[PDB]
């Protein structure tokens, strides 16, 4: 009796307006170095939380799970589940979005002021 994530990254998620990016790495949610934001390994999957300040004092959340063309099934399956978990952790308030390489929404692409970039490669599968 309860079922609450204690992961250190959940404790940082959505604390203030901004952009947070995590990569799936062998069944874990690992922060991306902020200097690397916008560069996506096509062989991987990622979780993106965009936090916006509301006039009301509370925060708006959009959760995007990005799937590279060569990411393995454990990675795209983890990215999705982590997305559900992060939304729950945030009291259901996030709006979830599935982003596929080559087909991302304009809002998502609009988060990367200097233009999202794809690069081949990535971290090996957790299976």
């Amino acid at each position: 009796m309860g079922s609450v994530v204690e992961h250190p990254e959940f404790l940082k998620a959505g604390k203030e307006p901004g952009l947070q990016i995590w990569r799936v790495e062998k069944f874990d949610l690992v922060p991306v170095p902020t200097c690397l934001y916008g560069d996506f390994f096509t062989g991987d999957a990622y979780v993106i939380l965009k936090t916006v300040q509301l006039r009301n004092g509370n925060l708006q959340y959009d959760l995007h799970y990005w799937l590279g063309n060569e990411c393995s099934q454990d990675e795209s399956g983890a990215a999705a589940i982590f997305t559900v978990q992060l939304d729950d952790y945030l009291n259901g308030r996030a709006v979830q979005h599935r982003e596929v390489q080559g087909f991302e929404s304009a809002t998502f692409l609009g988060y990367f002021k200097s233009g999202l970039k794809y690069k081949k490669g990535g971290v090996a599968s957790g299976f």
Partner: protein
């Protein structure tokens, strides 16, 4: 097999049990969900293939019917076999994830939980809906899963990670009904397939040579006129039979249940009906994420046909997408393997401590 604590995953079906280790990409043990007991004497019991092979002296049963457990004593034997004969582990040393059918009865959920902690002494366990685990395995949190196995089919709309229970639909039309129907139409063709051994041969024809036509009537037509698409099949004795339009007439029963004397809607219309019971604002994301799962979705052509049928049911501008992963026989199991391997799953399990405090009814709050 075993990271720190090694979780296990068991996907119990009406026809097959799929079991293994969290973190692997496939179930290590796949066996028939059958329990055999003596017609007369020796208490004793057999599971799976071994039950089938001594069938002439045993009374064979299926503890799961249409995805639901109907015999707990035989369900315990499947599990005992799973842990000790198939996976070779000590259940008391591993967290166990288990899967259930959509809408599983409340008392069944308790019982499963009770057996794990009291009969097997698992240190921790979890229950997950089969259809939700396939969706996850396809890398999505919103979509509709059409899951069809040996004994039951379901259409399950999911949104932001959870099934929408009011829109789930059940159809007691599946793999076994299909094998039976192929037995009957091959028998009308002029052959004879009526026994148990014959049912097994027929299941194999169904899995090797059957397919779904894109256009039923044009196909019937092409076969009425040409022989080009007929196939041979060698029986276990070396006799060879020829399969004609039975190839596609058997799985046609998924789309036309009247073929089996059933009055229900086919899988395409059941899918449509589930979508239409959901809020209009998510429907677009349902049509755009139709995931097929389970052994009975393995027929060649089924995705195209589902694509066509849904296209014909929905507004012409609706974008339809049928996703049919090559591994969809094991999607449920794989989703479970992914879920239980996550660094964040730790707190999601029901622990022994939580069981000792609330009892079996802990399952209704933890396994949502």
């Amino acid at each position: 097999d075993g990271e720190d604590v090694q979780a296990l995953v068991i996907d119990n079906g009406s026809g097959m049990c799929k079991a293994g280790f969290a973190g692997d990409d496939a179930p290590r043990a796949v066996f028939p969900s059958i329990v055999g007991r003596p017609r007369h004497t020796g208490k004793d019991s057999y599971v799976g293939d071994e039950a089938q092979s001594k069938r002439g002296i045993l009374t064979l049963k299926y503890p799961i019917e249409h995805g639901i457990v109907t015999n707990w004593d035989d369900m315990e034997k499947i599990w005992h076999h799973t842990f000790y004969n198939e996976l070779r582990v000590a259940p008391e040393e591993h967290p166990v994830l288990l899967t259930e059918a959509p809408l599983n009865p409340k008392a069944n959920r308790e019982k499963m939980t009770q057996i794990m902690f009291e009969t097997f002494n698992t240190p921790a366990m979890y229950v997950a809906i089969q259809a939700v685990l396939s969706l996850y395995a396809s890398g999505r949190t919103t979509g509709i899963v059409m899951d069809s196995g040996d004994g039951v089919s379901h259409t399950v709309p999911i949104y932001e990670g959870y099934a929408l229970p009011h829109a789930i639909l059940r159809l007691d039309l599946a793999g076994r009904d299909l094998t039976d129907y192929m037995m009957k139409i091959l028998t009308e063709r002029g052959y004879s397939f009526t026994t148990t051994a014959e049912r097994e041969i027929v299941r194999d024809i169904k899995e090797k040579l059957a397919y779904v036509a894109l256009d039923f009537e044009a196909e019937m037509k092409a076969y009425k006129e040409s022989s080009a698409l007929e196939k041979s099949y060698e029986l276990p004795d070396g006799q060879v039979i020829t399969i004609g339009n039975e190839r596609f007439r058997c799985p046609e029963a998924l789309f036309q249940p009247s073929f089996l004397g059933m009055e229900s809607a086919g899988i395409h219309e059941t899918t449509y009906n589930s979508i239409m019971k959901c809020d209009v604002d998510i429907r677009k994301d349902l049509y755009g994420n139709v995931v097929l799962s389970g052994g009975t979705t393995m027929f060649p052509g089924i995705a195209d046909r589902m694509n066509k049928e849904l296209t014909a049911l929905a507004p012409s501008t609706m974008k339809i997408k049928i996703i049919a992963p090559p591994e969809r026989k094991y999607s449920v199991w794989i989703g479970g393997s992914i879920l239980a391997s996550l660094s964040t799953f730790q707190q999601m399990w029901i622990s022994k401590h939580e069981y000792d405090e609330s009892g079996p009814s802990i399952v209704h709050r933890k396994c949502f």
